[PDB]
Design a protein around this ligand. Structure first.
Ligand code: CA
Ligand code: CA
Ligand code: CA
Ligand code: CA
Ligand code: CA
Ligand code: CA
Length: 452
């Protein structure tokens, strides 16, 4: 078999797998299947210039016919609502080729949106209309003594998510399905771990974002929302196309991608147009599981299934926190830093740069192609006697034959050291008489530091 360390990596890499199986008695839909589900109405703004340009207005007065809507007292968005709305708009503009510009309807635009508040509960907490309706672009928000959620929207709270959600609706995203409960959902991933359009809590899919008495809501489009809006309007490859850090020490310039404290509750899906990117979760003390696979989920900041990388996005680096984390790279050359604590790092393909950090770390390899002589991983701070190079997924615990020179026998391995403080582990898995696997290190590696 393999070690527990490999099994932990493998299990996590597949933990959130989607499609072709039932979950909660419902079909599991892949992100693409959900993108179809979320755009099933066929409604969308139309271009052309290749980009949809919408204008929007925070109404200062009730439109003609307003009183017949039964919404009660009309009121303009406060400065705080406008500020948050603009952030929500931006979060959609960031991922899809649609822009929002404050201003009255204009002949040159592709559509016009309005925002305003109403006071009569009978209207609902908030609502919006699809872009093919007579009230295309409109979204309305309830505010009265009995319902105060929309009066103070802010990063992470439902008021901000409501703005994001209603706008997603004005863009053409439907709610995931048609007292209903998650039981009536069409597919398993109909929860707010996957889409801000869902009415159901992440608890239904097992993720944990917060506890009773506290609110925790993604302020920006989540994984499936990004796929859905991009299916409608095209991916916006221009955003953050330069090098970007998400999380702690964020350089994304977005409130929902920034962490400044260990208690921060991050719930976001990373969209990026290119650049050597990093997921920095160094400031957390809780166990984390970071997956750099595109379209995959990570357990971050003491929560689970709360961070994801959008389909089509390549993230190159990850920095774990002080807990005992799992770090999973992708095919690209990744720089993975464990942090304090005992981490299990799996570079994947390409020539990775691995930092175990303090603590006792395990560097897992699941295939020979993971670390070849022509593209060898380098463990930058290997600590003999504490860290481990785990090849059990390859050897299946068959063991290795440590020799000073390859004999032509499969399984022969050579541990070397150069007193540039550089070590290396070479292996001839295929038995060709030469190394087909190579891992270099800064710091000595001993035969007893290898699990095979
Ligand atoms: Ca970038
Ligand atoms: Ca990148
Ligand atoms: Ca760590
Ligand atoms: Ca890699
Ligand atoms: Ca590798
Ligand atoms: Ca460590």
């Amino acid at each position: 078999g393999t070690s527990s360390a490999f099994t932990q990596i493998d299990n996590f890499s597949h933990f959130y797998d989607r499609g072709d199986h039932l979950v909660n008695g419902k079909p599991s839909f892949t992100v693409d299947q959900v993108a179809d589900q979320l755009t099933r109405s066929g409604a969308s703004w139309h271009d052309n210039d290749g980009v949809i340009n919408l204008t929007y207005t925070f109404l200062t007065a009730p439109p003609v016919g307003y009183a017949s809507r039964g919404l009660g007292t009309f009121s303009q968005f406060s400065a705080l609502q406008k500020e948050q709305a603009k952030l929500s708009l931006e979060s959609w503009a960031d991922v899809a080729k649609v822009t929002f510009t404050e201003g009255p309807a204009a002949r040159g635009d592709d559509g016009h949106m309005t925002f305003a508040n109403f006071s009569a509960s009978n209207g609902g907490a908030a609502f919006a209309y699809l872009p093919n309706s007579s009230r295309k672009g409109e979204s309305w928000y309830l505010i009265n003594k009995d319902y105060q959620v929309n009066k103070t929207p802010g990063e992470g709270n439902y008021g901000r998510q409501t703005l994001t959600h209603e706008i997603g609706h004005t863009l053409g995203l439907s709610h995931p399905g048609d007292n209903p409960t998650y039981r009536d959902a069409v597919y398993a991933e109909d929860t707010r771990a996957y889409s801000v359009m869902s009415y159901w809590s992440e608890k239904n899919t097992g993720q944990v974002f917060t506890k009773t008495g506290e609110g925790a809501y993604a302020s920006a489009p989540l994984l499936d929302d990004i796929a859905a809006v991009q299916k409608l309007y095209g991916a916006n490859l221009e955003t953050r196309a330069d090098d970007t850090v998400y999380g702690f020490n964020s350089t994304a310039d977005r409130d929902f991608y920034s962490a400044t404290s260990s208690t921060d509750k991050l719930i976001f899906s990373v969209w990026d147009g290119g650049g050597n990117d990093t997921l920095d979760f160094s400031g957390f003390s809780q166990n984390q599981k970071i997956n750099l696979t595109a379209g995959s989920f990570s357990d971050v900041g003491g929560m689970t299934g709360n961070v994801s990388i959008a389909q089509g996005v390549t993230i190159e680096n990850a920095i774990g926190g002080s807990g005992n984390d799992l770090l999973i790279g992708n095919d690209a050359a990744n720089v993975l830093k464990g942090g304090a604590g005992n981490d299990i790092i799996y570079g994947g393909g390409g020539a990775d740069v691995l930092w175990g950090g303090t603590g006792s770390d395990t560097f897992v390899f699941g295939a020979v192609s993971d670390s070849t002589p022509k593209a060898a991983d380098i463990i930058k701070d290997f600590q003999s006697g504490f860290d481990k190079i785990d090849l059990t997924a390859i050897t299946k615990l068959g063991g290795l034959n440590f020799v000073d020179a390859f004999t032509g026998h499969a399984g022969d391995a050579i541990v070397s050291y150069h007193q540039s403080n550089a070590g290396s582990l070479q292996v001839d898995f295929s038995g060709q008489g030469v190394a087909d696997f190579l891992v270099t290190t800064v710091g000595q590696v001993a035969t007893y530091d290898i699990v095979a």
